[PDB]
Amino acid sequence: MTRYVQRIGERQQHFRSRKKDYLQLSKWFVECRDSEEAHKLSAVVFGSMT
Amino acid sequence: QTQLFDEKAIQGMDILFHHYWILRAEQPEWYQLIREREKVLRRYLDEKFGLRLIVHQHFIKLEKIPVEPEGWMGIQDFQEPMDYAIFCCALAFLEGKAVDEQFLLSELCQEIQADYPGDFPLDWTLYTHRKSLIRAVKVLMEFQLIRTIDGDIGRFDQNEEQEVLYEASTYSRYFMRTYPDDFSSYQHWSELLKEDWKLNQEDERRKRVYRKLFFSPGLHRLDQQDPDFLYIRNYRNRLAEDIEKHSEYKLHVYKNTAFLSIAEPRQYQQVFPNSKASTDIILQLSKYIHGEPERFKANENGEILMTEGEFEQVVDDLRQQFGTGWAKYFRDMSTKGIRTELLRAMKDWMMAEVDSETSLIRIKSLTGVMTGEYPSDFQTGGTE
Amino acid sequence: LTEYRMFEYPEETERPEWFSKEWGEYYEPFMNEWNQLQSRRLILMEYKG
Amino acid sequence: LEQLEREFASSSRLVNQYHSYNQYILAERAGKWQDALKRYTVAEEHVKG
């Protein structure tokens, strides 16, 4: 119940969103004519896991 | 309070590096370990690399952004652009799902097909599209972006009507790194680095070189007058001193290359050489190129130049010398196939580049660090 | 209110065409005064998106 | 709740100032409008005479 009242408090301010972003990057992946170039673009997007 | 860089700090830093991020819910010990030194680590990361450490309730993450992206860096399980496109579409999908929301595999496939922004439509009746989606879903689940209720996606390979029920986990929110504006004001990915450079004017050279060195197995000299290599030459000694104080690595320097070696790798760590046979054949090729320095006279830049024809002759020569002991996979494969795979492999670890047009092979000085041969009992008793 | 990204924007009048039929002297001051004073400021607010 | 009350108080201050501003804008335009109408009526009387 306290969580719900708190949520009512959160419902006045919280909202965010970032979906739009993914479209341009997916398209850029579309232009990837070769998957090593695409790997490089991926490393742009998030770097290296290791 | 005070803290010092010790075994724990090295291990936490290394553990952080060899994974994209560490989750509290599954790796609480490493997360806590990282947390005790987090103060020194944040300062230090800023000082040497300039990377931003994000510490959260559910995760800790380092946007290991490279100085110049390279093919091997990317998620390797993926093999085509379509895989990345499906990944991005999946991300877009997760933006549409509330935390702990439950969704069907079919809804995800349909939504990805509908949203897919390319000119050429994605079709699920095909096998390749389904394979791309399955690879995307496995990678997604690896980062716990999606939880598993029930079903089996592997059956999806030969049965598109297959169904599975997944649940969107909290991590979907935080997956995307921190990117300041509307990406559209940017016109090409190369423009992204200019962001990474608005924050690092202070000792930009040291942080740039450090990032280049620490990420890649090695750092190749661009030319005779490379400012970066001169810089490396300048601190020279203190870089080595710092590395001894701060990490497992041991620095090496040569006229046309510089790189970090590692003395004690561990299970979770990645290193070269490793089990894959192609490394073995690469080392044998290294010895063969080393053995005729004058015929394979290295250019001023430390590179050794051979044409695709010469490489195929060399591969035949290698099958002649070391071939009885190669793995049956390569022993049974034609020369050109072996050539394609070995050259891609050598590219991934940055030993060499193949010019696409002129077919010239550039073997980087880093290649000459290691050479390999069989045990003497085979040298007698083998491909002798 | 910073989360709302307040913002203002000036409102202007499209200089009405009948202004062209020059009236000079006695009317020039009134046209100039109206041209200066006709501009007013507006406010629009990004309230919860 | 404290954030909402703070933001509401700021919005109240802003809206009161903005409403005074708009009252002034409308009042000024009305005063000039009255001057125009007065002069037009006077002009019509003059025209008739």
Strand and helix layout:
The structure is cut from a larger assembly and holds 1 copy of chain A (50 residues), 1 copy of chain B (384 residues) and 2 copies of chain C (49 residues).
Chain A: H1 2-10, H2 19-31, H3 35-46
Chain B: H1 7-18, E1 21-23, H2 28-36, H3 38-48, E2 53-55, E3 59-62, H4 81-95, E4 102-104, H5 105-115, H6 127-142, E5 146-151, E6 164-168, H7 190-196, H8 204-215, E7 218-220, H9 227-235, H10 237-246, E8 249-253, E9 257-262, H11 277-290, E10 304-307, H12 308-321, H13 328-331, H14 335-348, E11 352-354, E12 360-363, H15 376-381
Helix pairs in contact in B: 1-2, 4-5, 4-6, 11-14, 12-14
Chain C: E1 6-11, H1 28-37, E2 40-45
Antiparallel strand pairs in C: 1-2
PDB class: dna binding protein
Keywords: SMC complexes, JetABCD, DNA loop extrusion, DNA binding protein
Entry title: Neobacillus vireti Wadjet-II JetABC dimer
Please provide a written account of the structure:
It is classed as dna binding protein. The entry lists the keywords SMC complexes, JetABCD, DNA loop extrusion, DNA binding protein. Neobacillus vireti Wadjet-II JetABC dimer. Chain A: JetA. This is part of a larger assembly, with 1 copy of chain A (about 50 residues), 1 copy of chain B (about 375 residues) and 2 copies of chain C (about 50 residues). Chain A is an all-alpha fold and about 50 residues long. Chain A is built from 3 helices and no strands. The longest helix of chain A has 13 residues, at about 20-30. Chain A is elongated. With about 375 residues, chain B is of the alpha+beta class. Chain B has helices at about 5-20, 30-35, 40-50, 80-95, 105-115, 125-140, 190-195, 205-215, 225-235, 235-245, 275-290, 310-320, 330, 335-350, 375-380, and strands at about 20-25, 55, 60, 100-105, 145-150, 165-170, 220, 250-255, 255-260, 305, 350-355, 360-365. Chain B has a 3-stranded antiparallel sheet with strand order 1-3-2, covered by helices on one side. In chain B, a hairpin with a 3-residue loop joins strand 2 (about 55) and strand 3. In chain B, helix 1 packs across helix 2 and helix 11 (about 275-290) packs across helix 14. Chain B is globular, with a radius of gyration of 24 Å. Chain C has about 50 residues and is an alpha+beta fold. Chain C contains 1 helix and 2 strands; from the N terminus they run E-H-E. Chains in contact: A-B, A-C, A-D, C-D. The interface of A and B includes residues 22, 23 and 42 of A.
